[PDB]
Structure 1
Amino acid sequence: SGFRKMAFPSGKVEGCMVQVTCGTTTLNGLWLDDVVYCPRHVICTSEDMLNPNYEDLLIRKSNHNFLVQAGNVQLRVIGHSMQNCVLKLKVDTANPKTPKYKFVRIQPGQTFSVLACYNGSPSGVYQCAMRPNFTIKGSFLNGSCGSVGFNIDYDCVSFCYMHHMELPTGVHAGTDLEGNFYGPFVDRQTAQAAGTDTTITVNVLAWLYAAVINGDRWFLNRFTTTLNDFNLVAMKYNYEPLTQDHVDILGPLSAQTGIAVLDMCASLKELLQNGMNGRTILGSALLEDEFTPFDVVRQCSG
């Protein structure tokens, strides 16, 4: 029993983190096989960060302008290339701790673990969701550029996020590992705005199922609703609309608890219209939306 914000074990990723310095600019990189992946922003000097011309800046560098440090060992850069917003540094040593891995772009609403790193050293691990406005509500200080987000499927690390910047509202933005931004952001040191965020409805329903599994049942009720009446209320409250795909995804949890999805939707409609009135669910006084159906199954069934 119990329900916590649970991250994936980070050891397989920790062995891939390095420090990358170009001049006095320094950040984290990811060392897989004989390539180091890092934000191309590392090739900027102070003057360059506000409005860089990356193709120009890269032409002016040589392999020896790049200092890669893997703990004590320095790694020899033998080639470099740019792919969208990442830089790929070819090094002369393949990382012997390279896990089985793949590069995967995630969708809004999906969760992943973040390994926060500073000067190439892992500092902490936490779980977070990609928000509908393509930002994450992370926890990052100066120096965390290049930290990665990942999921684990069996023995395979799926890398899905490389951290680039903090926006003025204190939320975070980054790219997939092919260097393509999540959201309408660009890698320059200018103020950019995220679009308005929304609540991830299918995740809130998954978390209500988790509560029932853990014995929190006070919000349940005898009523049912239809997708359409639900979505008309949800829209009013800045909730993502629910689809029949969402309903099938919640299948295993409906099975395990015997409560139909549209039955649980009727409970959610009640909570939205009446609030919770000082009761809590799984120790929270707000509706949680950062746990996926799969997160709940992984944690409440194994």
Structure 2
Amino acid sequence: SGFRKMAFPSGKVEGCMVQVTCGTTTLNGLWLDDVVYCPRHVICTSEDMLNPNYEDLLIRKSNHNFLVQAGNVQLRVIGHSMQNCVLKLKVDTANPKTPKYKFVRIQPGQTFSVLACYNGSPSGVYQCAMRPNFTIKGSFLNGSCGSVGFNIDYDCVSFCYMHHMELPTGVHAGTDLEGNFYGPFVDRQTAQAAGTDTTITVNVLAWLYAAVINGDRWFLNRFTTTLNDFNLVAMKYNYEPLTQDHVDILGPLSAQTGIAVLDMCASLKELLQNGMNGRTILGSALLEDEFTPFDVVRQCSGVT
């Protein structure tokens, strides 16, 4: 028992982290096979970071300008190319520590582990969710660019995020491993609206099921609701509307606790309308939305 914001073991990803230096900028790169993936803003200076012409800036660069170091060993760059907002630096040596991997684009509301890195060196690992508005509420300082987000299924690492930018609001923006930004963000130092965020309803419900599994039951009530009535409450409190697909993904947790998804929705409705009343659920005094139904089953069953 016990419920924690658990991240995947970072070992497989630590073995892929390299340092990428171009001109005066240093950031992190991801070494998979004979390719190093890093944010394309590694080629920028402070002057052109307000409105960079990436094509023009990359034309002034040759393979020898991209200094790539894996710990204390220098990788030899034999090709470079820009794909969307990422640079792919072909190296003459395949990473001996390349795990089984995939590049995936996650959906908003899905979760992933982030291995924060500086100068190609891992500093820490944390779990987070891709917000409905495509930002991440991470913990990143200058030099963290190129740190990646991922999920692990047995031995396969699914890379879903590469960190690029911190918005003036303090939230984080980045791309998939093909360099496509999540959200409307551009790699420019400019005002960028993150857009209205919402609470991931399906995840809060999944977390309520984890709370019941782990003994926290005070919030369970004698009521039930319908998807329509619950969605009126979700509307009022800036929660994502709940669909039948969400109810279906909550099937296993509903079967495990024997608490019908709509009865759990009525518990969430009462919590939204009345608050916690100074109480806690799984050590939190607010409704937690960074655990998916899959995360809850994974943690509550012990998949390795």
TM-score (norm 2): 0.98
CA distance in 2, matches of 1:210, 1:256: 10
4+ residue runs of structure 1 moved beyond 2 angstroms? none
* Displacement after TM superposition at 1:58 (Å): 1.1
CA distance in 1, matches of 2:19, 2:76: 13
* Displacement after TM superposition at 1:65 (Å): 0.9
Map of 1:83-122 to 2, 5 A cutoff?
83-122=83-122
Q: Percent same amino acid among aligned pairs?
A: 100
* Displacement after TM superposition at 1:290 (Å): 0.5
CA distance in 2, matches of 1:217, 1:38: 46
* Deviations, residues 69-123 of structure 1 (Å, cap 9, x unaligned): 1111101111101100000001111111000000000011000000000000000
RMSD of Structure 2 on Structure 1 (CA): 0.7
Map of 1:140-219 to 2, 5 A cutoff?
140-219=140-219
**Contact 1:168–1:193 (CA<8 Å) still a contact in 2?**
no
* Deviations, residues 181-204 of structure 1 (Å, cap 9, x unaligned): 000010012231210111110000
* Deviations, residues 19-64 of structure 1 (Å, cap 9, x unaligned): 0001111100000110000000011122221111011111111111
Greater shift, 41-50 or 233-242, is seen at 41-50
Greater shift, 57-66 or 34-43, is seen at 57-66
* Deviations, residues 213-255 of structure 1 (Å, cap 9, x unaligned): 0111111112111100110111011000000000000000000
TM-score (norm 1): 0.99
Unmatched runs of 5 consecutive residues or more in structure 2: none
CA distance in 2, matches of 1:294, 1:14: 24
* Displacement after TM superposition at 1:207 (Å): 0.4
CA distance in 2, matches of 1:208, 1:291: 10
**Contact 1:36–1:90 (CA<8 Å) still a contact in 2?**
yes
**Contact 1:78–1:92 (CA<8 Å) still a contact in 2?**
yes
Unmatched runs of 5 consecutive residues or more in structure 1: none
* Displacement after TM superposition at 1:212 (Å): 0.4
CA distance in 2, matches of 1:226, 1:189: 46
* Displacement after TM superposition at 1:168 (Å): 0.8
Is 2:247 aligned against 1:285? Answer: no
SS at match of 2:117: strand
Greater shift, 241-250 or 268-277, is seen at 268-277
Greater shift, 130-139 or 43-52, is seen at 43-52
